[PDB]
Design a protein around this ligand. Sequence first.
Ligand code: HEM
Ligand code: HEM
Ligand code: HEM
Ligand SMILES: CCCCC[C@H]1C(=O)O[C@@H](C)[C@H](NC(=O)c2cccc(NC=O)c2O)C(=O)O[C@H](C)[C@@H]1OC(=O)CC(C)C
Ligand SMILES: C/C=C(C)/C=C/C=C/[C@H](C)[C@H](C)[C@H](C)[C@H](C)CCc1oc2c(O)c(OC)cc(OC)c2c(=O)c1C
Ligand code: FES
Lengths: 379, 49, 100, 59, 241, 48, 78, 66, 49
Amino acid sequence: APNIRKSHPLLKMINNSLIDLPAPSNISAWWNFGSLLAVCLMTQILTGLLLAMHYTADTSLAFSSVAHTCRNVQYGWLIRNLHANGASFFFICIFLHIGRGLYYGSYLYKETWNTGVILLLTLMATAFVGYVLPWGQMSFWGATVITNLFSAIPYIGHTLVEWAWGGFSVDNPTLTRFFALHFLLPFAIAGITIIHLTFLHESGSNNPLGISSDSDKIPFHPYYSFKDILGLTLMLTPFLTLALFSPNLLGDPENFTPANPLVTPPHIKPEWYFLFAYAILRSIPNKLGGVLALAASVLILFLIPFLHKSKQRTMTFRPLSQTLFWLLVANLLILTWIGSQPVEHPFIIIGQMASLSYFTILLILFPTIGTLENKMLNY
Amino acid sequence: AAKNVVTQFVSSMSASADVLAMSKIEIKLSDIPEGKNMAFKWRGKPLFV
Amino acid sequence: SRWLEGIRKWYYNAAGFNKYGLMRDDTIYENDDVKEAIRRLPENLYDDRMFRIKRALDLNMRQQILPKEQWTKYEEDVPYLEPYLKEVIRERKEREEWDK
Amino acid sequence: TLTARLYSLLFRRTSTFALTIVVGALLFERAFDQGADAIYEHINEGKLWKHIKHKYENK
Amino acid sequence: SDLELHPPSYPWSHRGPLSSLDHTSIRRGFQVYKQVCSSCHSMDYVAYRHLVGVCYTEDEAKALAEEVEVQDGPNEDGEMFMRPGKLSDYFPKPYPNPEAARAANNGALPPDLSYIVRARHGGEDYVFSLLTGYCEPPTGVSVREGLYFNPYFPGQAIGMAPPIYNDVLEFDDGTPATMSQVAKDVCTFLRWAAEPEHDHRKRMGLKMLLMMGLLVPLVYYMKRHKWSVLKSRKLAYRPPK
Amino acid sequence: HLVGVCYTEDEAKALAEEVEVQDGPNEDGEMFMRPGKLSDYFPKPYPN
Amino acid sequence: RQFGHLTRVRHLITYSLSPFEQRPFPHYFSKGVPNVWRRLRACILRVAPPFLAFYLLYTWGTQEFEKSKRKNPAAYVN
Amino acid sequence: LVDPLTTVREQCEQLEKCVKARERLELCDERVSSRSQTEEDCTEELFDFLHARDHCVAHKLFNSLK
Amino acid sequence: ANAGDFGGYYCPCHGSHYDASGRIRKGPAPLNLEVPSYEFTSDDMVIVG
Ligand code: HEM
Ligand code: HEM
Ligand code: HEM
Ligand SMILES: CCCCC[C@H]1C(=O)O[C@@H](C)[C@H](NC(=O)c2cccc(NC=O)c2O)C(=O)O[C@H](C)[C@@H]1OC(=O)CC(C)C
Ligand SMILES: C/C=C(C)/C=C/C=C/[C@H](C)[C@H](C)[C@H](C)[C@H](C)CCc1oc2c(O)c(OC)cc(OC)c2c(=O)c1C
Ligand code: FES
């Protein structure tokens, strides 16, 4: 090969995943989400790796340390800001990325999709820790529930927790051992992400119409490379805007008060990118039920591929399920609001309700409106 | 071989060989008038009287 | 009271996959059966379908569609693959049953 | 005719192009900052330490 | 009753995504903290060091920190001993420990005001209100021995007595030291205090915004420039017959 | 440690009683001495 | 999957011009903006509805809550 | 020396809303302090006032402050 | 303490309401609060543990 861009074991990979990669010609922004997700993975790993350069995982020093890392380290403040927010831009993109995939049945690439879930899960997992790290009122009390959340699993539970975290109560150990997980985990996300793309490439990228694209397919490089660099700057501007103008805009301030093992803040509102499932959890009064609900609240994505009935892949030609879809996306934006809302009649019910449409819309509505639309075509 | 190495590197966390027993606390009941509840720092978690 | 006929017509224009100018069948996700189906297609209809798809893609990729004129009309939609696909399926269902 | 003069001389040879990105960046920097800094400060007259530094250094 | 009153918004001199903090105001904000809050309110994350170049002068802050003696390292004979507060010391703690403070403030714990502004929803708007805003409990409502009604505070019963009235001090710059006024200055401080980066952070934001403005279009052209090959493009099916 | 290795629980406990240790803040917050429990570390002879 | 082994494509003549011989800008106000609306108006009636519905359920929910807080002038007329 | 606050709360305490509120309160106040046994509290009413008062207190107060 | 619909307790985490006895009455909480080992040593004395 005179090529080189193809005759070099390493070098090929690149000129095979960034150049020369066949990608569908027709692809909406909803396809950038992922390349972005990467940039987050990076921005997170880069900033956090750098923020760990100043963190001091240990109760008595943990909180302050960060403060120091901000006030004392040049641009250390910027680093933090960026980090906590990448967290979000990260969940945002992920939340959108899942959207797109859901409504173009990209979940048909199963493996590429299943791995995806894992990523989500992990990204949810890693983000749980890390937030504990700054050891604020939130950090602490989040540690205590989320962890204790495994209380539900019988027999192996109470035990698994008094292990999950340090000894018998969220205390220093749990902290150090969390930092470790956090420092570690992201690198797992990175790995799996590789596994994710691998599975993908096995099957070209999807495409909005949901019909073969071999008919077209353009060289990833010339095109999409730019397109990514663009989307990079686009959904980079907001994230930065936040980080430079109203950083804590998304960040609960309650966490600015160092942890107190004795008083959980009246008004414990979990992180936004978590609220939905949060709601679901509390609107199902039963430790186990509460948890279970939650369990499936996210662990349901795994079933979407089996809850696909449309004779067509995407649903751009499925106006019916189509609105059912937004009924879902909104039913989600709802659960969220209902999550950032205390528990009283005005809410609560609304809660468990949406926290019912959620499931049904998925487990039942979709597949039904699914076959139905096929018959409205003689299929 | 493994069975153990596992067990080992599994208890290399559970507990910590550091356990207390402050199980004994003295309270002035007069500090808590009728109708209210006082909270105390006791054994890693709060105590209500 | 309400014609399934009357309805299908709805859904058809509602799906609006004819705005891109491609027959119903030009859409059905390509699963094992369909592939075999399409692989049985007479070369005539194949190249036809292809272009229709590439055109569809090209449009879609431009975000623009086909002039109100060129949309395909419900009654004129040609189920060019349904027939093959069906044999396929039953061919299979025949085999699947025999292997028991 | 700028654009033409530019291309031929600056953007044609991949060797050159780059060279102007550099020398250009140096210029863009220096200029963008001074401009930015000014825009900023001006939108905050008498509020910055640079601006009160004087009640222990006059103004 | 989970019934509460939400603090009105004041057009602070530094609210604007592009407006820095009135450093003059912070200077006073500092003094009001030093002269009246720094006797109950600890502020562990700042230090005279900062004031230098932001609202005070090197020599100014140095002599400013001399103003306090601090317990420092072991002797040769090893014994804590006091000595003039240097420049690098952190703002003095009023109490050796919390429970000590709680025993000094009618059983309450005056929270450290380092990150106060961003630890309570509302920041300055809240804080300001809280200070300038005490009053007799409406009827049927009775605050117990030692507390003081303040509508804006949850429970409406605070353990902090109105710590700010007219003249409590005298801003050496010649500023009508009215409550409203001082209380303002304290808040603008509490802000910087909570996030010194403020200005530097917004200025930055400025530039960041001018780059997006400039960069994104550029790459947009580039994105379109490159795609035109396709956007433009034209198909056609020509079989032989 | 001593417990189970060269001493007995009750043995070490009373063994640790043998020393008073400076411990946490009052309510009025002030270091105060109190009987050395079982979990204390061997006494330091010098403050520093 | 790489290039040259994608599909059996026959008889498709495509003509495209170098980007430098054409204009990227494009034809806004002619085909540009028009199609944009051609779409806002196409899906508006398919996307907005549910969001709108939420909104209501949000407001309703909030007001009611904010109401159930205020006293019934007649919870004690005596 | 006079606190621009108190002066500006004077003007504000006169705006239509304040009055339509200050009144609503005044009643409740003397509506609860007039009885021996009542659970009512004039907090709510109190807020509504404040809420309204301070609101303009803000629209103007910072103008007189340096 | 001193909050909730059962005049005992309320946990802001998931809405579990407790009665003044520490029992769970409403919400997702599973068992009633923990009652430590204790006794009174006199008229004003109370010892927990
Ligand atoms: C000095 C200008 C000053 C400020 C500013 C101030 C503010 C302040 C805040 C914002 C809080 C409370 C926030 C909350 O919701 O808990 C707070 C709390 C207390 N303070 Fe204060 N305070 C100022 C000065 C002083 C001074 C001089 C004293 C001691 C005389 C004092 C005390 C306290 C106490 C006690 C509280 C406790 C609140 C409670 O738990 O009920 N403050 N202060
Ligand atoms: C996968 C992406 C990551 C996620 C989801 C993430 C998320 C978080 C979050 C939300 C916090 C709490 C921040 C806050 O207080 O608001 C955090 C803290 C932290 N993260 Fe990450 N993190 C990630 C990766 C990293 C990496 C790779 C490291 C280093 C190995 C890291 C090190 C830290 C440090 C130092 C803190 C403590 C200081 C702080 O709280 O800001 N993070 N991370
Ligand atoms: C770990 C972060 C993740 C990264 C960085 C990542 C990356 C990618 C990328 C870049 C693609 C290429 C096409 C595109 O951009 O959409 C892709 C596709 C896909 N990813 Fe992810 N992904 C991540 C997480 C997930 C998650 C959480 C899901 C789970 C629902 C998921 C599901 C998919 C699907 C279904 C596709 C294939 C179909 C298609 O591309 O149209 N991904 N992902
Ligand atoms: C030495 C560098 C090797 C390059 C690695 C890097 C490589 O896959 O880069 C792209 C192709 C990848 N996305 C895409 O290919 C992609 C695919 C379909 C459409 C679009 N665009 C939408 O319009 C894409 O953008 C994007 O998601 O990054 C991944 C995931 C990976 O990088 C990650 O492991 C890094 C993590 C592990 C830290
Ligand atoms: C080290 C990692 C371990 C032990 C594993 C933990 C597993 C993490 C999982 C994926 C995470 C929490 C998921 C987003 C779950 C499903 C959502 C539930 C969730 O619930 C919460 C909750 O009920 C709270 O009650 C007061 C408070 C909270 O924060 C202050 C949260 C919270 O932050 C999250 C998020
Ligand atoms: S933590 Fe008590 S309601 Fe769940």
